[PDB]
Amino acid sequence: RPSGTYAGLPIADYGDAPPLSTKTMFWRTSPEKLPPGAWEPAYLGSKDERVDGPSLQQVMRDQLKPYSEPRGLLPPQEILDAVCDAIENRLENTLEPQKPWTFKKACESLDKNTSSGYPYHKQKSKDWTGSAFIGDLGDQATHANNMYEMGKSMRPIYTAALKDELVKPDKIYGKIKKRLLWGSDLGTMIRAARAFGPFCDALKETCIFNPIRVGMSMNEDGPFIFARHANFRYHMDADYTRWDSTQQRAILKRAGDIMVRLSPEPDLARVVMDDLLAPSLLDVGDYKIVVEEGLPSGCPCTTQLNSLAHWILTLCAMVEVTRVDPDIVMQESEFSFYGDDEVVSTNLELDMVKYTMALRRYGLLPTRADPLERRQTLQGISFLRRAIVGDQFGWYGRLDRASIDRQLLWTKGPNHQNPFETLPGHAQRPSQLMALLGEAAMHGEKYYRTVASRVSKEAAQVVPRHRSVLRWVRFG
Ligand SMILES: Cc1nc(/N=N/c2cc(S(=O)(=O)O)c3cc([N+](=O)[O-])cc(S(=O)(=O)O)c3c2)c(COP(=O)(O)O)c(C=O)c1O
Ligand SMILES: Cc1nc(/N=N/c2cc(S(=O)(=O)O)c3cc([N+](=O)[O-])cc(S(=O)(=O)O)c3c2)c(COP(=O)(O)O)c(C=O)c1O
């Protein structure tokens, strides 16, 4: 029955979503005071002692606004078609054909320590026997799977949440921001896993010679990835603001068509992709609202869809500007896409001003670093949280010290209301401490020493010498 607009978006029904969480999973590693400008867990609502801010619902409405903004322009249809053929073609020539996913495999693949979403909103593990969903979720899972096998449509219902994560302090103590998560319903997760699990698996296997890098290991795969990029003359590393909310469904639809066409049960996959990209029903608590545009997350094959969309858009811009055919562009370039993160290396003479304009024309908001700049060295180019570094031995991804120290101050634990509480006792995190030494080692012995000290100090409440970890971490 209900009508109107919530955060600029049409209301379609009453909502069933539980209330937004007021707790964080972050705990300080020490009771001492935080260094100034330190990152902290994002805002926790009216109950947050650190600051008096608006309601979580208001913070969520802020995040929903960009979804009602006008879309940018679709790329010129001929470029769009050639690019999409060229990307599909590239995948046909590289991906290993997969057998269908079983219902059993699909259910196994899901993360069992997160919510089931609409309508039970229970942690998946609570109806999971080890090998099958039973009880309530078993009924949802079974129904969804029957619909899948019958090629019948089902309207996903997403549940909005806000992301508990560390953030720069201005997002707590200034203008408060917190990231919108889209939380899928178990049924949609099942259908999506069955439909697209094969493609995603096939794609992960090619993460070194195909540009969708999802599933890569920074440590083991990065040096080969980065060495490939280095073979090309110009390097650029666009950063994008609000990638997800600025997507066009029409482009996501072209990405999806490629996924469907490269899946083992394409007729079944088609029904699922059409449900995923049909106007989206999102439960914000009081209301379920309809979101026609942007990317709907928590798919969970979304990161692939998104990366694929990114590949389409970047390539469309490049082709529009250089006028080189998309296949030849892939001969003369090396891409890395990981959702919204990009690295483009190319031999082509690319007009950076025109490239920036074409992306802005599509609705995207490219930004780096302080139009897009291109460099003749990969040194310093950013990828995920790393800086790409090269030396006599080769290339690697070095985590910035910011993130390193940040991991020294904060640890994960059970949800609580006050993030400045420390956990009692240990400090049960030896693996991370070592990895941190590793990450610190790549910064040189001077820095490694500092970090070694703190790591030792904390490990009190085997820490190797520098040259041995550095060797283990780069080569090992
Ligand atoms: C400090 C810390 N780091 C976490 N993971 N961060 C990731 C996590 C991943 S993940 O392998 O996709 O989970 C990262 C992956 C890539 N990658 O190029 O494939 C790169 C990076 S990055 O160091 O360059 O940013 C990745 C960083 C995580 C995520 O761990 P989890 O949810 O898998 O258990 C946690 C949470 O436990 C955490 O406390
Ligand atoms: C690039 C990349 N990074 C991921 N995790 N990022 C996190 C994620 C976390 S998390 O909030 O514990 O999930 C990080 C936590 C801390 N921390 O000091 O507690 C530090 C860091 S860091 O800035 O040093 O790298 C954390 C980094 C993740 C993990 O994201 P997700 O499991 O929450 O969905 C992925 C997922 O595939 C990913 O692809």
From Swiss-Prot:
Catalytic activity: RNA(n) + a ribonucleoside 5'-triphosphate = RNA(n+1) + diphosphate
Location(s) in or outside the cell: Host cytoplasm, Host perinuclear region
Residues the record lists as binding Mg(2+): 237, 239, 341-342, 382
Domain named RdRp catalytic: residues: 233-354
Transmembrane segments: none
Regulation: Inhibited by Suramin, Suramin-related compounds and NF023. Inhibited by PPNDS.
Cofactor dependence: Mg(2+); Mn(2+)
Mutagenesis or variant effect for residue 348 to D: Complete loss of oligomerization of RdRp in the presence of VPg and RNA. Decreased interaction of VPg with RdRp. No production of infectious particles
Effect of residue 341 to A: Almost complete loss of RNA-directed RNA polymerase
Disulfide bonds: 299-301
Its biological purpose: Replicates genomic and antigenomic RNA by recognizing replications specific signals. Also transcribes a subgenomic mRNA by initiating RNA synthesis internally on antigenomic RNA. This sgRNA codes for structural proteins. Catalyzes the covalent attachment VPg with viral RNAs.
Subunit description: Homohexamer; also forms fibrous hexameric oligomer. Interacts with the viral genome-linked protein; this interaction induces the multimerization of the RdRp and enhances its activity.
Name by which UniProt lists this protein: RNA-directed RNA polymerase
Organism the protein comes from: Norovirus (isolate Mouse/NoV/United States/MNV1/2002/GV) (MNV-1)
Source species taxonomy: Viruses, Riboviria, Orthornavirae, Pisuviricota, Pisoniviricetes
Full-sequence range covered: 1184 to 1668 of 1687
